[PDB]
Design a protein around this ligand. Structure first.
Ligand SMILES: Nc1nc2c(ncn2[C@@H]2O[C@H](COP(=O)(O)OP(=O)(O)OP(=O)(O)O)[C@@H](O)[C@H]2O)c(=O)[nH]1
Ligand SMILES: Nc1nc2c(ncn2[C@@H]2O[C@H](COP(=O)(O)OP(=O)(O)OP(=O)(O)O)[C@@H](O)[C@H]2O)c(=O)[nH]1
Ligand SMILES: Nc1nc2c(ncn2[C@@H]2O[C@H](COP(=O)(O)OP(=O)(O)OP(=O)(O)O)[C@@H](O)[C@H]2O)c(=O)[nH]1
Ligand SMILES: Nc1nc2c(ncn2[C@@H]2O[C@H](COP(=O)(O)OP(=O)(O)OP(=O)(O)O)[C@@H](O)[C@H]2O)c(=O)[nH]1
Ligand SMILES: O=P(O)(O)OC[C@H]1O[C@H](OP(=O)(O)OP(=O)(O)O)[C@H](O)[C@@H]1O
Ligand SMILES: O=P(O)(O)OC[C@H]1O[C@H](OP(=O)(O)OP(=O)(O)O)[C@H](O)[C@@H]1O
Ligand SMILES: O=P(O)(O)OC[C@H]1O[C@H](O)[C@H](O)[C@@H]1O
Ligand SMILES: O=P(O)(O)OC[C@H]1O[C@H](O)[C@H](O)[C@@H]1O
Ligand SMILES: O=P(O)(O)OC[C@H]1O[C@H](O)[C@H](O)[C@@H]1O
Ligand SMILES: [Mg+2]
Ligand SMILES: [Mg+2]
Ligand SMILES: [Mg+2]
Ligand SMILES: [Mg+2]
Lengths: 206, 215, 207, 215
């Protein structure tokens, strides 16, 4: 399923990200802000069980507990992802982290580095983060690795994704929960997202 | 209008708050967490205009600018509200802050107090701009609304563009008691507990947020 | 004893606070920043016992545990103090907070408007009284007059700037107190403001 | 020069880090806490300039401005450092983040490792303005300093104004192996553990910071 989070709050931040006038401090900071907000969206979709707690005045009342918050494995795709993940962790403190290294349309992408914790089959909720999904190659390559682990669920957290990508990804993995703030219409020749926001990695790491 | 924010995330934190076993650190911390989350919600209700920015790649594109984020006066109802306001400020760093030291009078009686001797022992509110500012009144719990209504009497006078109320728990009695006397108010809350008890406390409730968070 | 924290880092932030060009966001934010920084300074002065812990290679070694971090009772001198206490809480999360509103009415003394201080454990709690500006030290002394009655294990005072008049009037009446501050300004006018200071902290912070 | 930051506050956090029973969250969180604390310590050694600002009181006063907070490049030695750098950034927001991915060529019981082979699987480092930038290399642990020296190998031909090393724990062997070759480096650390074992692990140490933090 596709989850486009276009509420005023996120669209407001996205705007500042897109604005070529926002410096690296504010750019990185907004990536963090969206990561936490984005993690709160993902939070509401997770499996939870009904519990009972007694209150100070000695009365019992039903409550909620998002159990799966203990079963999260965030996958950091090297670079631009670091800041976004820094937001996600605000919503998934108990999550373990994996990092991946890969690099280059349609051209195949190769994985050159990868240290991922052990994904508990049928239990874990893997969250693969990367601010931008253009052609969707990077993402799909990481996916191969992830599906092998047979996780309970797989989420993809991005800021902007091209239509080409969303469809590319959801067409081969309809069971994947793809979250994003905006879906931009095109990819020029260089494989860039338009309007997009330029190069996230560069705008944040500086 | 009434805004009950009962998404799994907030209901999850509320549970923690209600849990008598939840210690002081965690109690105070969840009040902050909800304040932040509630500010974000309140943020999506604010007036915004569409602007048009230019991306590094040279093109223009429509965006969003919540202009009213520059126009926010938060009212921190002294004590319990401090952790909650800390939360809100994460969503409204351009907000001015008024502090009101209200204090309720205890009354052990037969029924449930309708209104109580609520006198304000403190009140330093910054200048509110008529027909422009969005005043946000914060207080973790609204029981009989005594306190709340008492403050609204002060804020109203300054005719703000609109008034919000941010609470974690609110009794049915109160919600109605406020939306009746001030119908065009934006009341946000995570849960609406059925009834108030013999001593004006909310049931089930989460205990005395004031004591729980400051000790 | 007097603890003047004038390291480059704090003097750097103070400068921004003093600067008339620093807005409500940045002013309030630096009060928070200094609050946690001074909190760490107070931390280094607290009681702590030596403990033993086993490291991941099954090797036991000595370490440190500032348990007194469990016995903190911070007091808000209403308004300007809130942002300051916010940062201190970053260093004393387990602290119980106290709120207290006062006001004036040459060195005109004071009257207590509001006062809610949690129960202080005699010879156990480390009470920390927060208030960014200590001018004629009256507000401060009036609050002390109550805290001292509770015989806490210790008493700290956390401020950003304080006048020499104040530092001396406070440390002369209660010598055992730990007064922390970033700067000690020279004078104060006929009105009672600290010069050059930074203006009305409460107004610069709250707007 | 060597800067051992062993004040009660940092020794208190280190203890928690060493405590094998310190769960992942708390472990990661303390790495952040120390990163920020250690940064404020570094800020205190940076070149500063006296300035003059204006109080609203119309009056004027001399002040401090560590102008060098604009000339900082942090190199996040990959994995272990993420939490550590995450806090240094709390002290150096105007810093550019360089990122090197180092991986040690393990070895098993033999004798005690004197220097190990390092495999570079990633490198994105901004341009270091010669005679201008203060480069800060971060890595929780320094065992044989193999990794460290490997990185210094590049950060040095760039002649930065100054080079800092931020670590939580470093072995005697390492501190000496680094400062003997790069006498003028500013090496910051909370503790200097005595010996290393046959696998090159610090003792007593605190385990594998990367494994503890990334789980
Ligand atoms: N047990 C424990 N958990 C912690 C601690 N600090 C942070 N956490 C958890 O990590 C999450 C994110 O922590 P931070 O990076 O400090 O983020 P934050 O901006 O303070 O977010 P909030 O804590 O929600 O206000 C929190 O929501 C907590 O659930 C700590 O000292 N102990
Ligand atoms: N201009 C400016 N604004 C700041 C600064 N620090 C914080 N703010 C603003 O104040 C809000 C809340 O700041 P913090 O208390 O640091 O909150 P936070 O936990 O860091 O959360 P974030 O919103 O993710 O940064 C931010 O969303 C900013 O809009 C600062 O140094 N400069
Ligand atoms: N048990 C527990 N302790 C917490 C939690 N969040 C914060 N704390 C404690 O409170 C302190 C400060 O918390 P915050 O208000 O989030 O401050 P912060 O800006 O995140 O600062 P640091 O956590 O030190 O990085 C931490 O150092 C913790 O000791 C939490 O979720 N659980
Ligand atoms: N311009 C701008 N600067 C910011 C903002 N938020 C943070 N900063 C800067 O980034 C630094 C660290 O910010 P954060 O990562 O949020 O750190 P923090 O946990 O909030 O800690 P504090 O800065 O003490 O509040 C600060 O020293 C600020 O100079 C923001 O919204 N705008
Ligand atoms: O809707 P109402 O019936 O007026 O009650 C709500 C208020 O009462 C409690 O404060 P209290 O006066 O007990 O002060 P404290 O929280 O600072 O102890 C509570 O924290 C609210 O502030
Ligand atoms: O001082 P040295 O003897 O060179 O060894 C110490 C290094 O080992 C760890 O990284 P590691 O290569 O194990 O990678 P990881 O921490 O990312 O898992 C640590 O982060 C240091 O970089
Ligand atoms: O493979 P694509 O989806 O086309 O592009 C993905 C990468 O390109 C950008 O650097 C993103 O941040 C990812 O790292
Ligand atoms: O009593 P003084 O030390 O002269 O002045 C103290 C108060 O004046 C300022 O508002 C400070 O913030 C304190 O609240
Ligand atoms: O696998 P690595 O991270 O390279 O080495 C792991 C060990 O190194 C650390 O000192 C701890 O003792 C760990 O056991
Ligand atoms: Mg926190
Ligand atoms: Mg109250
Ligand atoms: Mg490592
Ligand atoms: Mg911040």
């Amino acid at each position: 399923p596709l989850y486009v989070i276009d509420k005023p709050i996120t669209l407001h931040i996205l705007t500042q990200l897109r604005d070529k006038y926002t410096d690296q401090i504010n750019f990185r900071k907004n990536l963090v802000r969206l990561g936490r907000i984005l993690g709160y969206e993902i939070s509401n979709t997770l499996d939870y069980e009904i519990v009972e707690v007694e209150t100070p005045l000695g009365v019992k009342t039903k409550g909620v507990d998002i159990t799966d918050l203990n079963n999260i494995v965030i996958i950091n795709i090297l670079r631009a992802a670091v800041p976004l993940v820094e937001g996600l962790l605000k919503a998934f403190p108990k999550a373990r982290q994996g990092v991946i290294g890969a690099s280059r349309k349609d051209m195949d992408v190769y994985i050159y580095y990868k240290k991922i914790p052990d994904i508990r089959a049928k239990v874990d909720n893997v969250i693969i983060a990367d601010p931008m999904i253009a052609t969707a190659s990077t993402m799909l390559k990481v996916l191969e690795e992830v599906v092998k682990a047979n996780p309970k669920r797989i989420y993809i957290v991005s800021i902007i994704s091209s239509e080409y990508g969303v469809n590319k990804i959801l067409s081969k993995y309809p069971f994947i929960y793809l979250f994003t703030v905006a879906i931009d219409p095109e990819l020029n020749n260089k494989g860039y997202i338009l309007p997009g926001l330029g190069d996230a990695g560069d705008r944040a790491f500086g």
